[PDB]
């Protein structure tokens, strides 16, 4: 008795677990090459308008590619949350969560372990895993110079995976200065990344100011000094009063000539109130029409038009002033200050350069690269780099990487497996062996041995040296403190918790129900 309708695919047998497990293996193997510093970039061919996209992050790749498997959606969704939460470590969650299901496959088939036992071991194994990071962390909050050095090494670790592995020595100073500029503001929207194609990749810079994408309107000068900035959000152009039911009962056109004159008088009166501040620059988000633009010429005030609302927030914080409207009361209102303003040209589009501002609560980064795809990759990289360093301020604790983070978890996880005697020990050992594969694929991408190199890292830590790790440029074990690579505590806490809970999803599934497409 077929209770379901026509064209209803249902799998209530071993093929359901096989179809769900092979889907994660396909998603897992897709991202094995993108992990590590020697990883290869991937290429995406869009189906609409031939809009290509080059990206190394697994979140952008898996969201762009179509996948009809329900298991693929979990790997897509866990990567989207990791991309939005931290902004780094998405491929580690995808490859680790798939490897946990890969390691859990042989327990179901060969050893015939219950699914409730595998997850029960992962609960106790994940608990001991996070406890290893509790003692393995180090707080560098007592000294700002050491914390300044920590943001360097975290930038070295995050930027090495992208195409900027050579130029990370220069952008590490650029990345950490933007974080010290923001002085704790973890909002990534306060950094404008201006995209410019052409020039050498190392020609990027970080000017102490805010760079506009637009220019002056008609005749206002390029070079000035000692300018007072005033920002406004209201219309300031052909003022349509708040009630639209207004009308003019005109008995003669001569009186209507006075009414349009009265609209110019109040606008002339409004610009007269702007001059009471004694300013030299005025900025408004709405596009400025011709009539109020002309009155700024006699007053000696500059005018900038059509600024975006997200840029007004960046513009207010770099200038250090305040957005002013309802200009009758100039006493309570506040305005910013700047030393020099000058219009520049980087390529074809001109830009406005600000330098010497008082407040430095925000900045803008100008990238320079050969193509729009390399420039885009650069943006995706800096965004991932600045996202990790931004959360490092609120979460000062850090963890050493390079295979040492995954192994010190396995050292504590393997110790706890003996005190839980029974059939659960195989599940906890499967969680341990899943963690050994992260330094394995990191060695496979560089073209080194998978067994002997991991075996040397195994013996080095149990001897009583909790600072050993993999070094990929030479292919041998080296000290992590001397090389200077380290990750944040929130990152390693996130990928272990995300990959652990991701394994809990597709292990509690036995039946797959597919309704009709719409």
């Amino acid at each position: 008795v077929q209770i379901f309708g026509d064209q209803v695919t249902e799998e209530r047998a071993e093929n359901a677990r096989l179809s769900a497990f092979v889907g994660a293996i396909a998603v897992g193997d897709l991202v094995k090459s993108t992990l590590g510093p020697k990883g290869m970039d991937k290429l995406l061919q869009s189906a609409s308008s031939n809009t290509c996209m080059v990206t190394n992050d697994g979140a952008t790749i898996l969201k762009s590619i179509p996948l009809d498997n329900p298991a693929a959606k979990v790997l897509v969704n866990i990567s989207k949350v990791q991309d939005d939460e931290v902004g780094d470590g998405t491929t580690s969650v995808t490859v680790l969560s798939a490897e946990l299901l890969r390691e859990a496959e042989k327990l179901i088939d060969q050893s015939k372990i219950h699914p409730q036992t595998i997850i029960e071991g992962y609960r106790l194994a994940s608990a001991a895993a996070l406890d290893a990071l509790t003692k393995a962390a180090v707080d560098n909050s007592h000294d700002k110079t050491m914390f300044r050095e920590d943001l360097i090494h975290i930038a070295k670790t995050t930027l090495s995976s992208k195409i900027l592995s050579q130029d990370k020595d220069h952008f590490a100073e650029l990345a950490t200065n933007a974080i010290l500029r923001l002085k704790g503001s973890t909002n990534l929207e306060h950094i404008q990344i201006i995209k410019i194609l052409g020039g050498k990749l190392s020609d990027s810079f970080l000017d102490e100011g805010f760079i506009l994408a637009k220019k002056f309107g008609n005749n206002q000068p390029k070079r000035i000094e000692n300018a007072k900035i005033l920002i406004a959000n209201t219309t300031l152009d052909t003022d349509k009063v708040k009630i639209f039911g207004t009308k003019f009962k005109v008995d003669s056109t001569a009186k209507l000539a006075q009414l349009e004159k009265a609209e110019r008088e109040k606008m002339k009166n409004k610009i007269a109130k702007i001059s009471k501040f004694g300013i030299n620059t005025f900025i408004n988000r709405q596009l400025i029409y011709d009539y109020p633009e002309q009155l700024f010429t006699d007053l000696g005030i500059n005018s900038i038009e059509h600024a975006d609302f997200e840029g007004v927030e960046r513009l207010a914080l770099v200038t250090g002033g305040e957005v002013v409207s309802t200009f009758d009361e100039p006493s309570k209102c506040k305005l910013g200050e700047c030393d020099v303003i000058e219009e520049i040209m980087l390529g074809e589009q001109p830009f406005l350069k600000f330098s010497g501002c008082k407040a430095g609560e925000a900045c803008t980064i100008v990238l320079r690269g050969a193509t729009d795809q390399t420039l885009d990759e650069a943006e995706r990289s800096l965004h991932d780099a600045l996202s990790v360093l931004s959360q490092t301020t609120k979460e000062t604790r850090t963890v050493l990487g390079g295979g040492c983070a995954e192994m010190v978890m396995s050292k504590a996880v393997d110790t706890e497996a003996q005190n839980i005697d029974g059939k659960k020990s195989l599940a906890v050992e499967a969680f341990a062996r899943a963690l050994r594969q992260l330094p394995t694929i990191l060695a496979d991408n560089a073209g080194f041995d998978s067994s002997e190199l991991v075996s040397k890292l195994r013996s080095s830590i149990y001897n009583g040296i909790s600072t050993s790790g993999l070094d990929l440029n030479n292919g041998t074990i080296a000290d992590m403190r001397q090389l200077g690579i380290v990750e944040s505590y929130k990152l390693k806490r996130a990928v272990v918790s995300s990959a652990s809970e991701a394994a809990e999803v597709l292990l509690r599934v036995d039946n797959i129900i597919r309704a009709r497409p719409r």
């Binding site: 194609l197 052409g198 193509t371 795809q373």
Partner: protein, 48 residues
Amino acid sequence: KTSRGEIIISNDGHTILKQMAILHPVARMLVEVSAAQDSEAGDGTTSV
């Protein structure tokens, strides 16, 4: 000969690569390099 009714003669490699609709994405990257060579230098768009 473009898709619409416009016709254009072109010796410039940037405008040749711009009007040519390429199916392969890696070959399409050369269109952006010629755009980058045209924006930065403005000479030798085919030599790059």
